Design goal:
Length: 378
């Protein structure tokens, strides 16, 4: 093609291409190495990625996200029914299949999850093509290891709809392991633990690898734990702060909250590299600006319980895999949230000082491995 590797995440998607013995994680039009898995519909246009997320605060009802939580599932599924209660967009039942319903150009329209995901994939495909200056057709698309046949089929379909020839659908943890060359033959079997804390989900997977063959020994985690929850803790903290300083509660102003959240998410990223971050919002509420700051220590305390809780699934995964900590040959960090220093400390401490594989940007590791595999299969 060359063939590309695409990591379709619940919050962000990433595309990479292997060329000249090296993987290139491709930046988008805005120079971002990952793209929001968002799609929006307006009176005049369909927006995807950065353009869609950049307007979610003003168009919550027609801005779709979390299609990954619906893909391949039935409308009557317990989790689907539960998730619906939290989404600002409508999810309808079409013969037992869930579809997101939105307004586009003044008319009501509905899309299957795979159609929404195909839109995101199309964006990733175009991002790769702009970089390569060539048409991209072949691709390896990844999915959470626990995905069933239906979810895998629907994901492949999303690719096909986008004009991609899906060479293979592979597990995210396996892609991560491949990124670090853990698939190479070294004689005996090796146990690898993948600690994946993304934007909306937490996945711990223990893989056993031998002769280039992967076996998913166990999986654990929380489908509703991720970076967004950390942003939430910060949002609540600042709503309280604004209330103290201005005797005004911004909680019911959906837009103000979303704008504060965006500022929090950015502040959070800064706290992974610096011990303090500044938040400066204009016209947050009733023309009142919100200029303040937060320390790394403060950020850690606001999320202490959530951070510490990530170790429970690690213990469970080990137990289910019938392995002691000492039997894990490698620990691979995946997901943007694993860039948080406190998370790395907790995991490393749990593993008695064992070093973590974190040289590859965690939020790019899956796409990196998928790109390598795509090359191999091409
Ligand atoms: N430097 C950073 N420090 C802390 N968090 C970060 C950093 N960079 C990105 N993140 C967070 O990582 C999350 C995105 O991670 P990633 O791109 O792995 O998500 P994803 O694959 O869509 O998630 P999931 O697999 O849970 O669906 C967001 O919550 C983002 O705020
Ligand atoms: Cl773009
Ligand atoms: Cl600690
Ligand atoms: K992703
Ligand atoms: K994840
Ligand atoms: K997941
Ligand atoms: Mg992910």
């Amino acid at each position: 093609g060359p063939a590309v590797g695409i990591d379709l995440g619940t919050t962000y998607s990433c595309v990479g291409v292997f060329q000249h013995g090296k993987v290139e994680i491709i930046a988008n039009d805005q120079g971002n190495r990952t793209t929001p898995s968002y799609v929006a519909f307006t009176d005049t246009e369909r927006l995807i990625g950065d353009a869609a997320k950049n307007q979610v605060a003003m168009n919550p009802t027609n801005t779709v996200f979390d299609a990954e939580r619906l893909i391949g599932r039935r409308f009557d599924d317990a989790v689907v029914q539960s998730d619906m209660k939290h989404w600002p967009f409508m999810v309808v039942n079409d013969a037992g299949r869930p579809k997101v319903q939105v307004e586009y150009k003044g008319e009501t329209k509905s899309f299957y999850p795979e159609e929404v995901s195909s839109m995101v994939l199309t964006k990733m495909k175009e991002i790769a093509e702009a970089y390569l200056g060539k048409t991209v057709t072949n691709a390896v698309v990844t999915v959470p290891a626990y995905f069933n046949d239906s979810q895998r089929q629907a994901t492949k379909d999303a690719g096909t709809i986008a004009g991609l020839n899906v060479l293979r659908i592979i597990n995210e943890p396996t892609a991560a392991a491949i990124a670090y060359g853990l698939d190479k033959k070294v004689g005996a079997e090796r146990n690898v633990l993948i600690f994946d804390l993304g934007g909306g989900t937490f996945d711990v997977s223990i893989l056993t690898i031998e002769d280039g063959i992967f076996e998913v020994k166990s999986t654990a985690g929380d489908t509703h734990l991720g970076g967004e929850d950390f942003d939430n803790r910060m949002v609540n903290h600042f709503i309280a702060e604004f209330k103290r300083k201005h005797k005004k509660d911004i909680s019911e102003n959906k837009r103000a909250v979303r704008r504060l959240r965006t500022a929090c998410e950015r502040a959070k990223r800064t706290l992974s590299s610096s011990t303090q971050a500044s938040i400066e919002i204009d016209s947050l509420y009733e023309g009142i600006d919100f200029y303040t700051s937060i320390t790394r220590a403060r950020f850690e305390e606001l999320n202490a319980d959530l951070f510490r809780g990530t170790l429970d699934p690690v213990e469970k995964a080990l137990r289910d895999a019938k392995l002691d900590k000492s039997q894990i040959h490698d620990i691979v960090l995946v997901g943007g949230s694993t860039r948080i220093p406190k998370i790395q400390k907790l995991l490393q401490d749990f593993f008695n000082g064992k070093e973590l594989n974190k040289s590859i940007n965690p939020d790019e590791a899956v796409a990196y491995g998928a790109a390598v595999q795509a090359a191999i299969l091409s």
